[PDB]
């Protein structure tokens, strides 16, 4: 006869920080063109292997937001519905793919 | 994955930032162990303990000058000395 | 083996802190500039110890978290890395404004 | 002549890293400071602004700002070759 | 040693629980932390070659 | 994400001659025109060109770490486990969902 | 939980002002852990008790204690279910039954071993470490141990958790309780014998406690306690009072 609410930071929550724990099936966005200082001075950094802050908070700088974390939960075993969208411009013959050379006699 | 992050353990107490203290959250066997073998193989530095400020009835939150300068009342400068008299003021509830 | 058992109890596990105990941030001050504003978003400040600050030459300081800083063409003493602070002076004042 | 001289009071302070404690009376009462655990600050978040003016140097320089944080870790080793550490920084939260 | 670099950090971890348990943040100063700690424990004029 | 954009050159040899006639170095790849063995190869009417189309492919649900740091590495490699330098955009998204209860 | 006994007490009970005199963070931590109690995992300690009993019963060697315990943690965690946890508790109750059966053996041997074993269980039955005056605490425990051993007619027993001590002087037998005495002896270990503490804790000592430490101080060394404590300088007086 009493309205006991569900846990805000419950078994299905996504707790980020002192803000409200977002509930289940949130989304995380990965982009290689973040405005940050992470991969700028990284030596062997390209669009294949890059570092990105998932934290796209409009207030915190991306450099200073990559030091935070996402706590999905510890009471549940989670799983992410990964979807990838890559763009490529490789040529036919290239030294990377070992296709521009051949040996003759 | 640990059985402690799963529960409602306060974050400051869990990381011993505002926790009870190494004398009282370690198992009573471990304090004896680290004390006994404390002359050759110390473990005391591996268990953190935080000293915490009193934060009550120790400091006024009132706007109170931390450093007061008192101008002289009269000077009476002379050839061999330089007199100054002040009016040092210690308000009620103040201590100098 | 006794020590291994009694260290695997969840109540008594190793806890470590960084002696610096400080989040490190570098704010660029151009050559002729004589002022600096440092604004940051809202933060909980749940256990702040205070503030520590000096100024260090940009040419004498590497980029934080950089595999290879190409612009770092200086091989003296990095005041950021060691304790070689020498520009604690040249600080006229400061104002801290939580709100 | 005494009217043709000046004064150049100055100071140098090497290896110091100017410190300001987040304590009410600017004095050390514990690692977890006097105001660092005040409920006005810990709960209600503040967007603090630090304003400087410096002596103008001749080359670009960084101002090396350090905050006062509890960057703590507790290493939970529950079992043979089972290692797990959780990280926590109080003002600028990193872990959870 | 590449300290306080999140892009080229080290990895200490177990085998059964392969999770990397060392995380280095670009906003911390490990070397200056060691400097201050070492200067607090003892005077700095001592020359320890090791 | 490479694809074969197959075309059909109507008169391959005719347009080959029509092209190398105005190449300003007409006998460029047609060295030894009189020979019938070392003569420039005739192009095929049916052929393909490497078509680079964006590959939006979803990888389904995979278990994730309970603690996701803000600094996240997105790595794309070939079968040689070498990063592909020929990517100018790589978009990824993760949508964590509860798979089971990790207690009791 | 001192919060529960601070709410359900008089206006300013001793633990109603123990929370009050804590710093704000410590008080808030106590309040939070009282309102919403954090759960604790029984296993990884019950398994430790089982392997410690196995080594104590001679089933395994203490050299292989930790390896066996961690292998058993694997075997439990990979099948952690209601039905294995009851087996874990069955083995822990098994350990307790074995320990009690062992104890019944020394209560059947010579009385100078029976009282010693009961005293070891008394010592295991209370706190083993104190925040202040730990040296005083262990010195008192050793003095009491050797007093019981070297007094042929000392008899230690338990009556509903209250471990009492009987000393038979032939025509009379004065009974002194150890549980309430050691309870009273808290915050007197770190005593710092001086001008103001003596009145402060001279009215804090019950006749039971003074009688206990008076009888204990008959075998008292200068290397037993801290050289400037109230208990040390009190037993220094009581030993010579016994002597003269």
CSV table of C-alpha atoms in Angstrom, one decimal, chain C residues 35-92:
chain,number,residue,atom,x,y,z
C,35,UNK,CA,47.5,37.5,-16.4
C,36,UNK,CA,45.8,34.1,-16.4
C,37,UNK,CA,42.3,32.9,-15.8
C,38,UNK,CA,41.7,29.3,-14.8
C,39,UNK,CA,38.0,28.2,-15.0
C,40,UNK,CA,36.9,24.6,-14.6
C,41,UNK,CA,33.4,23.0,-14.7
C,42,UNK,CA,31.4,22.1,-11.6
C,43,UNK,CA,33.1,19.6,-9.4
C,44,UNK,CA,32.2,17.9,-6.1
C,45,UNK,CA,35.4,18.8,-4.2
C,46,UNK,CA,34.7,15.9,-1.8
C,47,UNK,CA,38.0,15.9,0.1
C,48,UNK,CA,40.1,18.6,-1.5
C,49,UNK,CA,43.4,19.2,0.3
C,50,UNK,CA,44.3,22.6,-1.3
C,51,UNK,CA,46.2,24.1,-4.1
C,52,UNK,CA,49.9,24.1,-5.2
C,53,UNK,CA,51.2,26.0,-8.1
C,54,UNK,CA,54.2,27.5,-9.8
C,55,UNK,CA,55.0,28.5,-13.4
C,56,UNK,CA,57.3,26.5,-15.6
C,57,UNK,CA,58.6,27.4,-19.0
C,58,UNK,CA,56.8,25.7,-21.9
C,59,UNK,CA,60.0,25.1,-23.8
C,60,UNK,CA,61.3,23.3,-20.6
C,61,UNK,CA,58.2,21.2,-20.1
C,62,UNK,CA,57.1,18.1,-22.2
C,63,UNK,CA,53.6,17.4,-23.2
C,64,UNK,CA,51.8,15.3,-20.6
C,65,UNK,CA,51.1,11.7,-21.7
C,66,UNK,CA,53.1,12.0,-24.9
C,67,UNK,CA,55.0,9.1,-26.5
C,68,UNK,CA,57.3,11.4,-28.3
C,69,UNK,CA,57.2,15.2,-27.9
C,70,UNK,CA,58.8,16.6,-31.1
C,71,UNK,CA,58.6,20.2,-29.8
C,72,UNK,CA,60.6,19.2,-26.7
C,73,UNK,CA,64.0,20.3,-28.0
C,74,UNK,CA,65.3,21.0,-24.4
C,75,UNK,CA,67.4,18.6,-22.4
C,76,UNK,CA,68.0,20.5,-19.1
C,77,UNK,CA,66.0,19.9,-15.9
C,78,UNK,CA,62.3,19.6,-16.4
C,79,UNK,CA,60.8,21.4,-13.4
C,80,UNK,CA,57.5,19.5,-14.0
C,81,UNK,CA,59.2,16.1,-13.6
C,82,UNK,CA,61.8,16.7,-10.9
C,83,UNK,CA,61.4,19.3,-8.1
C,84,UNK,CA,63.5,21.9,-10.0
C,85,UNK,CA,61.1,24.7,-9.5
C,86,UNK,CA,62.7,28.1,-9.8
C,87,UNK,CA,59.9,30.4,-11.0
C,88,UNK,CA,57.8,30.3,-7.8
C,89,UNK,CA,58.5,34.1,-7.8
C,90,UNK,CA,57.0,36.2,-10.7
C,91,UNK,CA,53.6,35.4,-9.1
C,92,UNK,CA,51.9,38.7,-8.3
